[PDB]
Amino acid sequence: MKRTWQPNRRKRAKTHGFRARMRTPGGRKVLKRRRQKGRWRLTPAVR
Amino acid sequence: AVKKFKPYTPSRRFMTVADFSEITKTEPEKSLVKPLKKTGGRNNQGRITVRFRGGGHKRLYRIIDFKRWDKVGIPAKVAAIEYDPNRSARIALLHYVDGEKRYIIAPDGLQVGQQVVAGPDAPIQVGNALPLRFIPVGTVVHAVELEPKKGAKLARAAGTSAQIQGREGDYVILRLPSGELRKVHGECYATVGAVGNADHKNIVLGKAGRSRWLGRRPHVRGAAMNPVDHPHGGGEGRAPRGRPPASPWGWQTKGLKTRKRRKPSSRFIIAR
RNA sequence: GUGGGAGAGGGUGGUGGAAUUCCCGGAGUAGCGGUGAAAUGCGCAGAUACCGGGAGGAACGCCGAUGGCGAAGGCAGCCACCUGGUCCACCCGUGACGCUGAGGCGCGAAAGCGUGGGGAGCAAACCGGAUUAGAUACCCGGGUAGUCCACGCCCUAAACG
RNA sequence: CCGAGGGUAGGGCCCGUGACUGGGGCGAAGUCGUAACAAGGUAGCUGUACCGGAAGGUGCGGCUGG
RNA sequence: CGCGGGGUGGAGCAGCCCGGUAGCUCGUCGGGCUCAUAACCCGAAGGUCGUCGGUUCAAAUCCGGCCCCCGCAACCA
RNA sequence: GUGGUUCGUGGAGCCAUGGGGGAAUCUGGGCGGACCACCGCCUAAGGCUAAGUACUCCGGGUGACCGAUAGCGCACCAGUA
RNA sequence: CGAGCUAGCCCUGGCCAGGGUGAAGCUGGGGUGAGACCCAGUGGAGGCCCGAACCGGUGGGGGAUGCAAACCCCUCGGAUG
RNA sequence: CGAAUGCCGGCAUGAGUAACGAUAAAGAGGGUGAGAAUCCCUCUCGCCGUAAGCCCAAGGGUUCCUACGCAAUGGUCGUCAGCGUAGGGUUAGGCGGGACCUAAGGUGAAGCCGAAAGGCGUAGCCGAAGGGCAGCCGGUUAAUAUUCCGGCCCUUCCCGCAGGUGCGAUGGGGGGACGCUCUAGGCUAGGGGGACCGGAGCCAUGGACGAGCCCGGCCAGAAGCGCAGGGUGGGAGGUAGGCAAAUCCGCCUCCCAACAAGCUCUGCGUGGUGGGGAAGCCCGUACGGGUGACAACCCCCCGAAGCCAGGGAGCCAAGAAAAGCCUCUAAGCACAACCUGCGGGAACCCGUACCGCAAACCGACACAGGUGGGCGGGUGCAAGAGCACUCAGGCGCGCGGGAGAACCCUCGCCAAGGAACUCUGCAAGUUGGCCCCGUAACUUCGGGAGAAGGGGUGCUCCCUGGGGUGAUGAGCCCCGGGGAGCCGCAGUGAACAGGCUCUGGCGACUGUUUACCAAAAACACAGCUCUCUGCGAACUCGUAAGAGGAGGUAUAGGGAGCGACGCUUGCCCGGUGCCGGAAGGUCAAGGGGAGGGGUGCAAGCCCCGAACCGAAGCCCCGGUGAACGGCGGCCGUAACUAUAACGGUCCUAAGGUAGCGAAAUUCCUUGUCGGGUAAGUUCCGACCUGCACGAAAAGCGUAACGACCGGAGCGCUGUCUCGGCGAGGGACCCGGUGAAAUUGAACUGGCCGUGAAGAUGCGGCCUACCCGUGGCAGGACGAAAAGACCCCGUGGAGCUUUACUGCAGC
RNA sequence: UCGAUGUCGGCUCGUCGCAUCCUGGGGCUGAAGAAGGUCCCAAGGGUUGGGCUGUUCGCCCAUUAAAGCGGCACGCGAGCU
Ligand SMILES: [Mg+2]
Ligand SMILES: [Mg+2]
Ligand SMILES: [Mg+2]
Ligand SMILES: [Mg+2]
Ligand SMILES: [Mg+2]
Ligand SMILES: [Mg+2]
Ligand SMILES: [Mg+2]
Ligand SMILES: [Mg+2]
Ligand SMILES: [Mg+2]
Ligand SMILES: [Mg+2]
Ligand SMILES: [Mg+2]
Ligand SMILES: [Mg+2]
Ligand SMILES: [Mg+2]
Ligand SMILES: [Mg+2]
Ligand SMILES: [Mg+2]
Ligand SMILES: [Mg+2]
Ligand SMILES: [Mg+2]
Ligand SMILES: [Mg+2]
Ligand SMILES: [Mg+2]
Ligand SMILES: [Mg+2]
Ligand SMILES: [Mg+2]
Ligand SMILES: [Mg+2]
Ligand SMILES: [Mg+2]
Ligand SMILES: [Mg+2]
Ligand SMILES: [Mg+2]
Ligand SMILES: [Mg+2]
Ligand SMILES: [Mg+2]
Ligand SMILES: [Mg+2]
Ligand SMILES: [Mg+2]
Ligand SMILES: [Mg+2]
Ligand SMILES: [Mg+2]
Ligand SMILES: [Mg+2]
Ligand SMILES: [Mg+2]
Ligand SMILES: [Mg+2]
Ligand SMILES: [Mg+2]
Ligand SMILES: [Mg+2]
Ligand SMILES: [Mg+2]
Ligand SMILES: [Mg+2]
Ligand SMILES: [Mg+2]
Ligand SMILES: [Mg+2]
Ligand SMILES: [Mg+2]
Ligand SMILES: [Mg+2]
Ligand SMILES: [Mg+2]
Ligand SMILES: [Mg+2]
Ligand SMILES: [Mg+2]
Ligand SMILES: [Mg+2]
Ligand SMILES: [Mg+2]
Ligand SMILES: [Mg+2]
Ligand SMILES: [Mg+2]
Ligand SMILES: [Mg+2]
Ligand SMILES: [Mg+2]
Ligand SMILES: [Mg+2]
Ligand SMILES: [Mg+2]
Ligand SMILES: [Mg+2]
Ligand SMILES: [Mg+2]
Ligand SMILES: [Mg+2]
Ligand SMILES: [Mg+2]
Ligand SMILES: [Mg+2]
Ligand SMILES: [Mg+2]
Ligand SMILES: [Mg+2]
Ligand SMILES: [Mg+2]
Ligand SMILES: [Mg+2]
Ligand SMILES: [Mg+2]
Ligand SMILES: [Mg+2]
Ligand SMILES: [Mg+2]
Ligand SMILES: [Mg+2]
Ligand SMILES: [Mg+2]
Ligand SMILES: [Mg+2]
Ligand SMILES: [Mg+2]
Ligand SMILES: [Mg+2]
Ligand SMILES: [Mg+2]
Ligand SMILES: [Mg+2]
Ligand SMILES: [Mg+2]
Ligand SMILES: [Mg+2]
Ligand SMILES: [Mg+2]
Ligand SMILES: [Mg+2]
Ligand SMILES: [Mg+2]
Ligand SMILES: [Mg+2]
Ligand SMILES: [Mg+2]
Ligand SMILES: [Mg+2]
Ligand SMILES: [Mg+2]
Ligand SMILES: [Mg+2]
Ligand SMILES: [Mg+2]
Ligand SMILES: [Mg+2]
Ligand SMILES: [Mg+2]
Ligand SMILES: [Mg+2]
Ligand SMILES: [Mg+2]
Ligand SMILES: [Mg+2]
Ligand SMILES: [Mg+2]
Ligand SMILES: [Mg+2]
Ligand SMILES: [Mg+2]
Ligand SMILES: [Mg+2]
Ligand SMILES: [Mg+2]
Ligand SMILES: [Mg+2]
Ligand SMILES: [Mg+2]
Ligand SMILES: [Mg+2]
Ligand SMILES: [Mg+2]
Ligand SMILES: [Mg+2]
Ligand SMILES: [Mg+2]
Ligand SMILES: [Mg+2]
Ligand SMILES: [Mg+2]
Ligand SMILES: [Mg+2]
Ligand SMILES: [Mg+2]
Ligand SMILES: [Mg+2]
Ligand SMILES: [Mg+2]
Ligand SMILES: [Mg+2]
Ligand SMILES: [Mg+2]
Ligand SMILES: [Mg+2]
Ligand SMILES: [Mg+2]
Ligand SMILES: [Mg+2]
Ligand SMILES: [Mg+2]
Ligand SMILES: [Mg+2]
Ligand SMILES: [Mg+2]
Ligand SMILES: [Mg+2]
Ligand SMILES: [Mg+2]
Ligand SMILES: [Mg+2]
Ligand SMILES: [Mg+2]
Ligand SMILES: [Mg+2]
Ligand SMILES: [Mg+2]
Ligand SMILES: [Mg+2]
Ligand SMILES: [Mg+2]
Ligand SMILES: [Mg+2]
Ligand SMILES: [Mg+2]
Ligand SMILES: [Mg+2]
Ligand SMILES: [Mg+2]
Ligand SMILES: [Mg+2]
Ligand SMILES: [Mg+2]
Ligand SMILES: [Mg+2]
Ligand SMILES: [Mg+2]
Ligand SMILES: [Mg+2]
Ligand SMILES: [Mg+2]
Ligand SMILES: [Mg+2]
Ligand SMILES: [Mg+2]
Ligand SMILES: [Mg+2]
Ligand SMILES: [Mg+2]
Ligand SMILES: [Mg+2]
Ligand SMILES: [Mg+2]
Ligand SMILES: [Mg+2]
Ligand SMILES: [Mg+2]
Ligand SMILES: [Mg+2]
Ligand SMILES: [Mg+2]
Ligand SMILES: [Mg+2]
Ligand SMILES: [Mg+2]
Ligand SMILES: [Mg+2]
Ligand SMILES: [Mg+2]
Ligand SMILES: [Mg+2]
Ligand SMILES: [Mg+2]
Ligand SMILES: [Mg+2]
Ligand SMILES: [Mg+2]
Ligand SMILES: [Mg+2]
Ligand SMILES: [Mg+2]
Ligand SMILES: [Mg+2]
Ligand SMILES: [Mg+2]
Ligand SMILES: [Mg+2]
Ligand SMILES: [Mg+2]
Ligand SMILES: [Mg+2]
Ligand SMILES: [Mg+2]
Ligand SMILES: [Mg+2]
Ligand SMILES: [Mg+2]
Ligand SMILES: [Mg+2]
Ligand SMILES: [Mg+2]
Ligand SMILES: [Mg+2]
Ligand SMILES: [Mg+2]
Ligand SMILES: [Mg+2]
Ligand SMILES: [Mg+2]
Ligand SMILES: [Mg+2]
Ligand SMILES: [Mg+2]
Ligand SMILES: [Mg+2]
Ligand SMILES: [Mg+2]
Ligand SMILES: [Mg+2]
Ligand SMILES: [Mg+2]
Ligand SMILES: [Mg+2]
Ligand SMILES: [Mg+2]
Ligand SMILES: [Mg+2]
Ligand SMILES: [Mg+2]
Ligand SMILES: [Mg+2]
Ligand SMILES: [Mg+2]
Ligand SMILES: [Mg+2]
Ligand SMILES: [Mg+2]
Ligand SMILES: [Mg+2]
Ligand SMILES: [Mg+2]
Ligand SMILES: [Mg+2]
Ligand SMILES: [Mg+2]
Ligand SMILES: [Mg+2]
Ligand SMILES: [Mg+2]
Ligand SMILES: [Mg+2]
Ligand SMILES: [Mg+2]
Ligand SMILES: [Mg+2]
Ligand SMILES: [Mg+2]
Ligand SMILES: [Mg+2]
Ligand SMILES: [Mg+2]
Ligand SMILES: [Mg+2]
Ligand SMILES: [Mg+2]
Ligand SMILES: [Mg+2]
Ligand SMILES: [Mg+2]
Ligand SMILES: [Mg+2]
Ligand SMILES: [Mg+2]
Ligand SMILES: [Mg+2]
Ligand SMILES: [Mg+2]
């Protein structure tokens, strides 16, 4: 029956991607945080 | 007026439809329509600021004329009478001899074929728009400006009207469609006549769905909620209001008068 | 047929004034109402009586009569439209073309009903003051349907000469 | 084939009967009031409408059989 | 068995609280008006305050027991 | 009307200021804990100023610091799988 | 940080085998002073009917360390709104 | 360190136990190989076929094809694989997307707001499964193709030639440009038949050399043409409107066309040419190829939901935008420019493998689940996407072999009885499609209605009516009508396919709901009422700007109740709430300073301060019931008795009207009576003693509707008396793989006692050789879950209010 | 016993006690006979089917030799409901 993950390639970048994390100061810090922990990926990768 | 039905289904029994014999033209003036952005009750944050709205047939907006002093002294011939899905009333097509066409909100007893004019001049007749100061008293009028050059605001809904009960100085005395008594300014344009489609008030929706088509969705009573939700929520079975009756937000809904008292508007008002 | 008359006969649209009631304004004060007598009611938070302005509905005073009109029910300010019945004069036309009338069809005071609108005065119901042994009445103070309008039902009557 | 009837199904009318219930008739001396008959002490009756222990009360209109 | 209220002339109620001193309507009895009754008027009678105990000088009145009436409650189980 | 101060309205001054009022330029002004006199201190409504101070991404030195369940989460291609 | 589940709304697209019932209106005929209406044809309305897709989840059995952290069989509701 | 249901790791037990994931199903021969039930080939058998076949979009991201492999992954096995290694493989001016438009929404110069971060916002800009745009048939590879190749068509840009015209835009105008249901005409796709055309072959087993049997009889195609259809009037005069201008568009007038007539556009047809082209046999393919062939290439019929397409009719709920496109003029420029035709050149980026109802996507799995668009043949049954079989194509579900116990699951049948079962016909049966007859109370006249109950149903021959196609005629296809007969238990012969009536309750109704224990008498619903709201509306969101309301205006909008419809909805304003009230009372800061005080020599500075003026609120006055709400007690009385129409008295703001009533409400209670039954705590009817109904938290009814809840009949039944037999999938045995909770340790018997009160573990007695298998659940106070009940904790949280205290708002 | 001892009733399967419902054996009788009463002995076996209610119980229908009362966690939910 219909589950929680309905993958869609656009929504993802549209939603969690890099250009979008950068408009909200909330998200700029997400990046700040992630970058300082040395994440290899700061953002989910796509396609 | 007011088409009824054999009850060949329930809800088709008590149902009622308007009579469109008035309606002379079945598609609108492409020149005079613009599209209508449907709000869903929602405001500029995706917030519902009016409950229970949305659904309902898509509409095209008819851009209709409430200032008639653009066209002073020009006449126009009433061209057509149309369905307007955005209002109680019906709209008139009228071609000015100017060559310019506009929609007007259609007075009761206005034939296709009439010349009609707007101005301080102009004969006292259905369709004609003048300042109030030149309308003779005890005249039945509609679509009235509240203040000059600001546009028709009062008495625009199907069957509504106003009477000019007097004059005092720069201002004139009207009985509104609600029976309020209001002073309005001499220079406000009002077109003479009642509005008509006056039978509008007898339509009987007759079934749930037909209320959806006008884009109003179910309204659930306070009584039937929980406390988180409403002042009237709770109580094991049913139960009465248990307090002075209230709105969801908590103010009293039987009798409370909400008109701001210190409105300057109020010097110009004398009634109920 | 022709000419001619009287009439609140009917339907529609307008319109006038008199009074009542609310409202605004002025003055002005201690009572007003009401009754068999009173009380309830109203009034110093300015009533009643008085004057000026306004809004609104209903009904049409003298004319008016023991009168007229209509098949009955019924019909009364004034004006215009459409319109029914009816009488008289003259003896011009048609030639029994009549009378009645089971059913049928239609009209039908008031009160009631439906959907709207209107609501001044009056007023079932209701509340109160009185009266009585009591008083779910009669008198008095309040008062809602209703009375009015449009459409549509109801079909009754001391619908009586 | 038709066929007396039999059986199955479903209607119509008529009779009788039925806890209880509606009103009505009648019954020497019960209870409550006094509606009507004399301006019956509010003229009376009347169609209708609302009310009220009960006769009846009131509204609207009508009748005079004052 | 709990909590709270009550028990007063014949019927219905005051008085109890704040100790002395029992009232109100109806009914009742005597007279009156009436042909007579009702209405109406004038007069009158009628009580130990549920009860048993204590407090006080004195108790319907303050206190306790018993008997009664009215009301409320009797939940989670 | 508030805040700061040790000061919580307290005899509540000082410093700051959202609102109302609203001065003077040496004899002018603020202060020493309501206020008054006296005696003193100091000159608001413009600005700048090294050093002595904090920290440790980085480098070095040393541990009565750990020694692979310890020590950083990672001694190993870990902010990875 | 989340409306890629879910609830509502907005914009834009798409889907609903097949049968059944036969409203209005139209036309004709009858009716009448004129109407109302009556009949018949035609017509094809409807949160109308039966029923697949599609959307559901009535009852019952099974399943219960399951095929499955909600499933399976039978039965059942809507199916032009 | 021994305990913390401790932490991390390791290894046990349970146990060779349960399982091995759809009951669509297998068998044999041959090949390869160390090894084969499991890989390849053949053959036979079964299963999907509105799929379990084929094509798109998501998502996935090498899974694609070939070679070499088998340790691990594969629920067994593996020689195979979606697995390891390696190599190959995705070709576009026309397909999809971008150098095009705009939608919701987003963003945002101007602007507006906010402590900061930020919020809003006209324009523009971005944004598509919508609008706009030029490619069709075939062939080729192991693997890509509208991409490469072949044939035939087409677009845009740049440059030139020719011919034409005031050219010219981000501006004006037209157009784009529209809903739902029904639907005409003519096409196409697709399909069936053919005695005609073409074709390897075949005569079995009794018969057949036949008008036999089997196979196949098309695809694409510019101009031109032809058939159906869409769109559209023409000329001039006037011209003040379309924010400049216009010759355009609008409006008025005049004259012609009325129709597609003309012009124009699209579909389909034909078309030069180009291409395909079966069965069967052979060959050897893992899978393709030779010939069949020089293939044939045609008539008839059915026929779209697709196409002409902006078609038509009807209806109310009244049905996007912008560009491309055409026209119009402005600057400007007119040796420009643009229009037409022809010619040459120029034409970029990204996607293209493969899976794609699934073993490649979402569900930790090669998971019985979920996932949008298109195609989806044939026969029969009325139709159909239904059901049965079946083509193409695709599959037998990645553990097997046997056995033929109990028990289980899913099925099938049953003597007599027929609801006796049981909380209850739960379950299951019965019923069942279509044609015809026929059909009640009641009703809102539609319904109720598939009411109910009945008859028919196949085959054969004869006669026969109409329709569409054809010419009116044959043939073909569709709808029938009558007559005589045949066969079986049976003709909707298998499959899909209502059991029915009586009668209450609640709800008017179709709808909505607790994803995942409730689908309902709950919500919603049209409809009634109250109430607010004059428009910069009320109300909501926001500190705000702003927005919703609404580009609405009282026939509107918000809030509250009630809930179709019928008939109705009584009485009380004392308390509370809301509404009205110029007065009076009280009252905060403020005003006011009488008077008092500190201190100074003093002029002064400083402080305190009574009267009095001084909002809202509250008090006071009144109104208010579809506002919160409320709607009595005792005692007596009628000529039998009972009862009490009557009375008395105490209280209140007023004392429950109608109607209904042991009720979804009745305690006593299985009230009492009546009805149904042989028997009725349920059910129906009634009475009224209503513990504790009662009128919009509506009162009493109501036809129709209900997967709602009661009661009763008929019908029919393994529900039962009461069991039996039978089928398959498990259970059992064998080969392969092989878990789990739990588990102080165990050498773990009965009784009667004892014991912390329910003993294998202590006492006495009794019984008792060691170990297993298949079975049952009485016991280990068996497992699971640090009891949800209950109490405790000065633990928590949601909720309420005339609790306290604050804040928003007013 | 709250780091769990699942609760009424039914069905299934029972076993046990006797203070005996019935059948066998007895005494007494206000026991003529038959049939009763009442007490003693006796636990071997037996102890119906239905209507109502969840009901246990009870009431009732039709029978019977009779239509017994109890315990076993008000026997029994790792047996069902
Ligand atoms: Mg997940
Ligand atoms: Mg996408
Ligand atoms: Mg890196
Ligand atoms: Mg936003
Ligand atoms: Mg609404
Ligand atoms: Mg509601
Ligand atoms: Mg609720
Ligand atoms: Mg919430
Ligand atoms: Mg609340
Ligand atoms: Mg409440
Ligand atoms: Mg709740
Ligand atoms: Mg309740
Ligand atoms: Mg509730
Ligand atoms: Mg108002
Ligand atoms: Mg003559
Ligand atoms: Mg003659
Ligand atoms: Mg009449
Ligand atoms: Mg009348
Ligand atoms: Mg009435
Ligand atoms: Mg009326
Ligand atoms: Mg009166
Ligand atoms: Mg009066
Ligand atoms: Mg017969
Ligand atoms: Mg009288
Ligand atoms: Mg009398
Ligand atoms: Mg009288
Ligand atoms: Mg009266
Ligand atoms: Mg009368
Ligand atoms: Mg006496
Ligand atoms: Mg402080
Ligand atoms: Mg301070
Ligand atoms: Mg300041
Ligand atoms: Mg100092
Ligand atoms: Mg000092
Ligand atoms: Mg100093
Ligand atoms: Mg360092
Ligand atoms: Mg070391
Ligand atoms: Mg290690
Ligand atoms: Mg470590
Ligand atoms: Mg080590
Ligand atoms: Mg670590
Ligand atoms: Mg190292
Ligand atoms: Mg590393
Ligand atoms: Mg969503
Ligand atoms: Mg018709
Ligand atoms: Mg006709
Ligand atoms: Mg339907
Ligand atoms: Mg489909
Ligand atoms: Mg779905
Ligand atoms: Mg749902
Ligand atoms: Mg289910
Ligand atoms: Mg189940
Ligand atoms: Mg189970
Ligand atoms: Mg239905
Ligand atoms: Mg259906
Ligand atoms: Mg819709
Ligand atoms: Mg084995
Ligand atoms: Mg075992
Ligand atoms: Mg086993
Ligand atoms: Mg096994
Ligand atoms: Mg070999
Ligand atoms: Mg098929
Ligand atoms: Mg992709
Ligand atoms: Mg993946
Ligand atoms: Mg790989
Ligand atoms: Mg492969
Ligand atoms: Mg393996
Ligand atoms: Mg590989
Ligand atoms: Mg190409
Ligand atoms: Mg370019
Ligand atoms: Mg773009
Ligand atoms: Mg754009
Ligand atoms: Mg800016
Ligand atoms: Mg923004
Ligand atoms: Mg915007
Ligand atoms: Mg696009
Ligand atoms: Mg597109
Ligand atoms: Mg393209
Ligand atoms: Mg391929
Ligand atoms: Mg191709
Ligand atoms: Mg090519
Ligand atoms: Mg020029
Ligand atoms: Mg031009
Ligand atoms: Mg252009
Ligand atoms: Mg073809
Ligand atoms: Mg063929
Ligand atoms: Mg041949
Ligand atoms: Mg040959
Ligand atoms: Mg042979
Ligand atoms: Mg031959
Ligand atoms: Mg023209
Ligand atoms: Mg011109
Ligand atoms: Mg111009
Ligand atoms: Mg052609
Ligand atoms: Mg069309
Ligand atoms: Mg643009
Ligand atoms: Mg120029
Ligand atoms: Mg490709
Ligand atoms: Mg491909
Ligand atoms: Mg599936
Ligand atoms: Mg699909
Ligand atoms: Mg597949
Ligand atoms: Mg696959
Ligand atoms: Mg598998
Ligand atoms: Mg799957
Ligand atoms: Mg699907
Ligand atoms: Mg088919
Ligand atoms: Mg067929
Ligand atoms: Mg069929
Ligand atoms: Mg099928
Ligand atoms: Mg095949
Ligand atoms: Mg299997
Ligand atoms: Mg398998
Ligand atoms: Mg049998
Ligand atoms: Mg039998
Ligand atoms: Mg039977
Ligand atoms: Mg039974
Ligand atoms: Mg039984
Ligand atoms: Mg059943
Ligand atoms: Mg069935
Ligand atoms: Mg019918
Ligand atoms: Mg009928
Ligand atoms: Mg039938
Ligand atoms: Mg036959
Ligand atoms: Mg046969
Ligand atoms: Mg037969
Ligand atoms: Mg079958
Ligand atoms: Mg069937
Ligand atoms: Mg059926
Ligand atoms: Mg009941
Ligand atoms: Mg319902
Ligand atoms: Mg609900
Ligand atoms: Mg649920
Ligand atoms: Mg839940
Ligand atoms: Mg459910
Ligand atoms: Mg349901
Ligand atoms: Mg706010
Ligand atoms: Mg706005
Ligand atoms: Mg708007
Ligand atoms: Mg409203
Ligand atoms: Mg309700
Ligand atoms: Mg009421
Ligand atoms: Mg009353
Ligand atoms: Mg009150
Ligand atoms: Mg009051
Ligand atoms: Mg009040
Ligand atoms: Mg007030
Ligand atoms: Mg005052
Ligand atoms: Mg003061
Ligand atoms: Mg002061
Ligand atoms: Mg005040
Ligand atoms: Mg008052
Ligand atoms: Mg009564
Ligand atoms: Mg009754
Ligand atoms: Mg009762
Ligand atoms: Mg009963
Ligand atoms: Mg009750
Ligand atoms: Mg009986
Ligand atoms: Mg009985
Ligand atoms: Mg009985
Ligand atoms: Mg029951
Ligand atoms: Mg009953
Ligand atoms: Mg109730
Ligand atoms: Mg109540
Ligand atoms: Mg109420
Ligand atoms: Mg109700
Ligand atoms: Mg009822
Ligand atoms: Mg009913
Ligand atoms: Mg339903
Ligand atoms: Mg239901
Ligand atoms: Mg059985
Ligand atoms: Mg068996
Ligand atoms: Mg078997
Ligand atoms: Mg023991
Ligand atoms: Mg031992
Ligand atoms: Mg020992
Ligand atoms: Mg022992
Ligand atoms: Mg064993
Ligand atoms: Mg056991
Ligand atoms: Mg077992
Ligand atoms: Mg605990
Ligand atoms: Mg606490
Ligand atoms: Mg408070
Ligand atoms: Mg416990
Ligand atoms: Mg334990
Ligand atoms: Mg346990
Ligand atoms: Mg014994
Ligand atoms: Mg014996
Ligand atoms: Mg014996
Ligand atoms: Mg004997
Ligand atoms: Mg025995
Ligand atoms: Mg025994
Ligand atoms: Mg029975
Ligand atoms: Mg029962
Ligand atoms: Mg009992
Ligand atoms: Mg028994
Ligand atoms: Mg037990
Ligand atoms: Mg259990
Ligand atoms: Mg156990």
XYZ file of C-alpha atoms (C1' of nucleotides) in Angstrom, chain H residues 385-472:
88
model
C -13.611 -3.900 -21.061
C -18.451 -9.165 -18.006
C -17.774 -14.764 -18.018
C -15.723 -19.452 -20.572
C -12.186 -21.121 -24.052
C -8.418 -19.114 -27.189
C -4.437 -16.173 -31.052
C -0.096 -13.383 -31.096
C 2.827 -13.200 -27.348
C 4.088 -14.810 -22.249
C 4.283 -18.097 -18.431
C 4.207 -23.371 -14.776
C 5.310 -18.753 -9.866
C 14.251 -20.895 -7.719
C 13.526 -26.901 -2.973
C 12.351 -31.845 -4.348
C 11.022 -37.216 -3.806
C 7.225 -40.220 -1.436
C 3.486 -41.497 1.982
C -2.132 -41.375 1.652
C -2.588 -41.046 10.284
C -4.853 -37.732 13.980
C -5.710 -32.783 13.423
C -5.975 -27.888 10.204
C -7.104 -24.966 5.767
C -9.985 -24.533 1.037
C -13.498 -27.552 -1.402
C -17.433 -31.397 -2.870
C -21.814 -34.843 -1.421
C -25.300 -36.787 1.998
C -30.749 -41.030 4.400
C -35.040 -38.758 7.656
C -35.898 -34.098 10.088
C -35.621 -28.487 8.607
C -33.216 -23.169 12.799
C -34.593 -28.092 16.852
C -28.289 -24.565 16.145
C -27.203 -19.962 18.365
C -26.223 -13.841 21.750
C -28.311 -13.847 16.134
C -29.869 -18.521 10.367
C -23.623 -16.266 12.145
C -22.038 -19.341 8.299
C -23.755 -21.724 4.335
C -27.387 -22.746 1.290
C -31.803 -21.010 -1.588
C -32.500 -17.149 -5.468
C -30.402 -15.716 -9.808
C -29.583 -13.874 -17.143
C -33.066 -12.460 -20.616
C -38.411 -12.695 -23.023
C -43.773 -12.751 -21.318
C -47.805 -12.663 -18.072
C -48.628 -10.289 -13.591
C -48.127 -7.261 -9.030
C -50.706 -4.960 -2.545
C -51.111 -1.619 1.642
C -49.291 3.062 1.463
C -47.586 7.681 -1.389
C -44.558 13.454 -1.513
C -48.285 10.130 -7.607
C -42.228 10.066 -8.996
C -42.554 6.016 -6.566
C -43.568 1.544 -3.677
C -41.601 -2.240 -8.401
C -36.906 -6.971 -10.098
C -42.959 -5.751 -5.270
C -44.958 -10.568 -4.709
C -46.148 -15.161 -7.842
C -45.822 -17.302 -12.240
C -44.979 -19.216 -17.739
C -40.755 -19.527 -21.718
C -35.657 -20.846 -22.738
C -32.319 -26.495 -26.950
C -32.518 -28.780 -31.490
C -34.981 -29.782 -36.881
C -37.834 -28.934 -41.220
C -41.746 -25.733 -43.705
C -44.187 -21.156 -44.281
C -43.065 -15.681 -43.502
C -42.673 -9.372 -42.039
C -39.586 -5.196 -41.700
C -34.669 -2.858 -41.647
C -29.136 -1.183 -43.259
C -26.054 -2.184 -47.509
C -26.725 -2.770 -52.430
C -29.859 0.054 -58.063
C -35.706 -0.744 -56.423
